[PDB]
Amino acid sequence: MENFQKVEKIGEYGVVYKARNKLTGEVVALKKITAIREISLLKELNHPNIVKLLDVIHTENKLYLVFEFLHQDLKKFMDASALTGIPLPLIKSYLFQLLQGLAFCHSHRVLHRDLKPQNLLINTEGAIKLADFGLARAVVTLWYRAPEILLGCKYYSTAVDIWSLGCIFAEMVTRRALFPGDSEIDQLFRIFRTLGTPDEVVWPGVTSMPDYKPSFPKWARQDFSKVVPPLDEDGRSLLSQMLHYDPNKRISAKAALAHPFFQDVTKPVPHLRL
Numbered sequence: 001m002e003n004f005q006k007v008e009k010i011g012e013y014g015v016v017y018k019a020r021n022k023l024t025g026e027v028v029a030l031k032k033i034t035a036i037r038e039i040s041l042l043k044e045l046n047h048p049n050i051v052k053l054l055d056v057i058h059t060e061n062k063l064y065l066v067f068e069f070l071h072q073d074l075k076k077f078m079d080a081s082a083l084t085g086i087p088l089p090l091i092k093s094y095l096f097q098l099l100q101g102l103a104f105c106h107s108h109r110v111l112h113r114d115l116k117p118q119n120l121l122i123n124t125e126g127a128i129k130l131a132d133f134g135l136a137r138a139v140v141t142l143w144y145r146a147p148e149i150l151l152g153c154k155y156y157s158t159a160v161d162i163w164s165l166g167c168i169f170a171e172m173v174t175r176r177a178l179f180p181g182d183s184e185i186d187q188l189f190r191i192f193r194t195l196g197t198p199d200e201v202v203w204p205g206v207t208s209m210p211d212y213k214p215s216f217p218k219w220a221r222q223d224f225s226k227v228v229p230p231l232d233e234d235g236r237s238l239l240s241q242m243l244h245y246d247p248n249k250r251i252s253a254k255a256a257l258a259h260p261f262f263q264d265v266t267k268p269v270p271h272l273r274l
């Protein structure tokens with residue numbers, strides 16, 4: 001690690017730093033944290049929409065991960081685009097690319113588990129990539145947590161990543177977080193108030209989940225025309241399938257890529273202020 005010089009703090013698994021390789025002049029993203037094996041497995045998991053894991057350094061009982069450096073994260077970009085909003089064509093491009101990244105990771109049996117604007121990175125060329133993948137297996141925000149996780153499911157599936165991405169999708173479109181909960185129960189009830197309290201009809205087996213309680217209030221479902229007004233009908237049908245209660249009914253990344261919404265997708269370049 002004496003080969004790297006910290007430049008600035010990026011965020012805080014561990015803390016992430018923007019650093020410089022004094023043995024190449026290369027700029028990278030440095031994260032300071034059975035594990036060794038799992039981590040080494042992610043270094044082979046390469047794709048255009050996944051932040052590349054360059055090296056793993058295990059020393060002094062400490063674990064350091066070296067990642068390629070990207071220009072800005074989605075949280076900052078959304079804040080910067082708050083006045084006029086991100087153009088629809090760019091929103092569509094970002095969603096399409098992220099679905100490609102998830103389709104790839106999911107085909108390799110790897111899930112993210114904690115997708116959020118903060119770990120989605122973009123560059124001046126118009127690309128977007130997933131970061132902090134698989135690490136989630138080797139104050140925190142609950143806004144993007146899938147309902148099966150909140151209800152105590154022990155062995156959830158790749159479907160949890162689709163739910164998180166759907167929430168991010170809605171947020172780029174409306175400039176408002178879909179389910180901004182500040183506690184697990186508040187998060188769960190916010191989802192219920194919008195999508196309706198789930199029951200055995202729409203979600204077989206839900207009433208027998210670890211944290212489900214017959215005493216839950218029973219709210220009715222709302223129309224998506226009210227949830228995401230500026231989104232056209234193809235966008236709304238796609239979003240509804242990404243937000244299905246039953247993990248088994250929720251659309252897969254692969255199936256989503258074939259949805260009508262993407263028939264006119266393109267790759268615009270963002271206006272980034274660095």
Ligand SMILES: CN(C)CCCNS(=O)(=O)c1ccc(Nc2nccc(-c3cnc4cccnn34)n2)cc1
Binds near residue numbers: 069072
């Ligand atoms: C809270 N504010 C002070 C803003 C914080 C910084 N936001 S930013 O858009 O300037 C900005 C954010 C990120 C970058 N680069 C960059 N490249 C590659 C990776 C990462 C990055 C971030 N978490 C993680 C977690 C794991 C792995 N990688 N990894 N980050 C540049 C700029």
